Amino acid sequence: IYPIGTIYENAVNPNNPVTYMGFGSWKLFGQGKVLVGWNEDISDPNFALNNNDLDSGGNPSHTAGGTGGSTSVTLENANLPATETDEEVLIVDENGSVIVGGCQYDPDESGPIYTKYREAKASTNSTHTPPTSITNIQPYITVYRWIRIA
Amino acid sequence: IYPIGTIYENAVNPNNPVTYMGFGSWKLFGQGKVLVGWNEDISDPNFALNNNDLDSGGNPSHTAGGTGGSTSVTLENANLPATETDEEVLIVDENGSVIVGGCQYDPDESGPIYTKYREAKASTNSTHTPPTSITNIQPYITVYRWIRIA
Amino acid sequence: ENANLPATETDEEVLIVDENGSVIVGGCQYDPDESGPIYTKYREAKASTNSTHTPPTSITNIQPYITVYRWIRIA
Amino acid sequence: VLGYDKIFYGRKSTDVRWSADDVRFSSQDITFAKLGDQLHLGFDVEIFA
């Protein structure tokens, strides 16, 4: 009924296919992996070609056991959309209609001035650069699955 | 013992599932897919009307033929946390402390004429809308599925 | 959520506020009349990017996959 | 130099001052607050005082 190298499971017991199922003996195939159909089509990225098996040319056969996916994906500046600031703020360019001035006609001393710092790249989130990486998956049907050897 | 529609597959062998299962015929399924629950839970996220599953009015059963999501995806502006750039930057207002000046002595054009350009919106990573698309594939061993025709 | 983010730096330059800063707003404008254009590029503050964003929309995870009824035999 | 604002040693430029003499100065500005004694190790002559 259950061919060579079973696709098999159990939801409950402690033990192998020998004690509970009783015909054969088992181990967990795909531990932490989440099963997906290996199509004769080799394309769809985590559904496609084996992350164990591949040719010496790289070609993984349409074939099973192949791996895809992992726990935690992180957000790097390759991942972000374009955006605008949320107001009118003064950026730095040489057509500008507002001239910061060459120098102070400033006969006094203590009438309050500023130091507008050097025009540079305007830094967001550099306090936490690497920060949070959200979980990329769906809720678990996960149970200790002993897949009968044969 | 195994009606058509129970968990229906074969783990390794390239060939169909008849050649072993020895009862009848079995037809391959799961190509570019995965086994998720469609629960009797009717209002559950994936369990109500599977993609092809609908009434004309939209109502399937609480039932199968399921689909949803894909591994890699990325943001639109409304996908973005609440961003603020660290070091304190000036912006437009009518309320401010910083006097611009609209005219002056710039009697000598000879001063360094440093004119930052207009008040505006500051583009972050404007180069690309198409961010990095985090794989939502989760650790996944592609396992062969030939579903039982009966 | 605003924790999660690469650090970012705006695609061209603009004026931080540091007390070593090169450019200078002057001790005051020289503002003889009202006709010399006033303004304020206003006091420094946080930057604002997407306060149109409160908590956002959330891009899906689970991948196209048969949603079926796992049949566990009750006992 | 001495000044009403501060007692300070400015950039004290050398070589040929060009459009890039400006951007050459901005580095020494931060170096005034650097205090690390390394910074750009400026070949363009300057003094912190």
From Swiss-Prot, chain C:
Induction: Expressed in the late phase of the viral replicative cycle. The chain holds residues 528 to 602 of 602 of the full protein. The gene is 10. Belongs to the T4likevirus baseplate wedge protein gp10 family. Homotrimer; disulfide-linked. Heteromultimer with gp7; a gp10 molecule is disulfide-linked to gp7 and the other two remaining gp10 molecules form a disulfide bond. The gp10 trimer interacts with gp11 trimer and with the short tail fiber (STF) composed of the gp12 trimer. Part of the baseplate macromolecular complex which consists of gp5, gp5.4, gp27 (central spike complex); gp6, gp25, gp53 (inner baseplate); gp7, gp8 (intermediate baseplate); gp9, gp10, gp11, gp12 (peripheral); gp48 and gp54 (proximal region of the tail tube). This is Baseplate wedge protein gp10. Peripheral baseplate protein that is part of the tail fiber network. Connects the short tail fibers to the baseplate. During infection, the baseplate undergoes a conformational change from a dome-shaped to a star-shaped structure. At this point, gp10 rotates and acts as a lever that unfolds the short tail fibers, which then interact with host cell surface receptors. Involved in the tail assembly. It is found in: Virion.
Swiss-Prot record, chain D:
Intermediate/inner baseplate protein. The gp25-(gp6)2-gp7 module is involved in sheath contraction. Involved in the tail assembly. This is Baseplate wedge protein gp7. Heterotrimer with gp6; assembles as a (gp6)2-gp7 heterotrimeric molecule. The (gp6)2-gp7 heterotrimeric molecule further interacts with gp25 and gp53. The gp25-(gp6)2-gp7 module is involved in sheath contraction. Interacts with gp8. Binds to gp10 homotrimer; disulfide-linked. Heteromultimer with gp10; a gp10 molecule is disulfide-linked to gp7 and the other two remaining gp10 molecules form a disulfide bond. It is found in: Virion. Signal peptide: none annotated. Belongs to the T4likevirus baseplate wedge protein gp7 family.
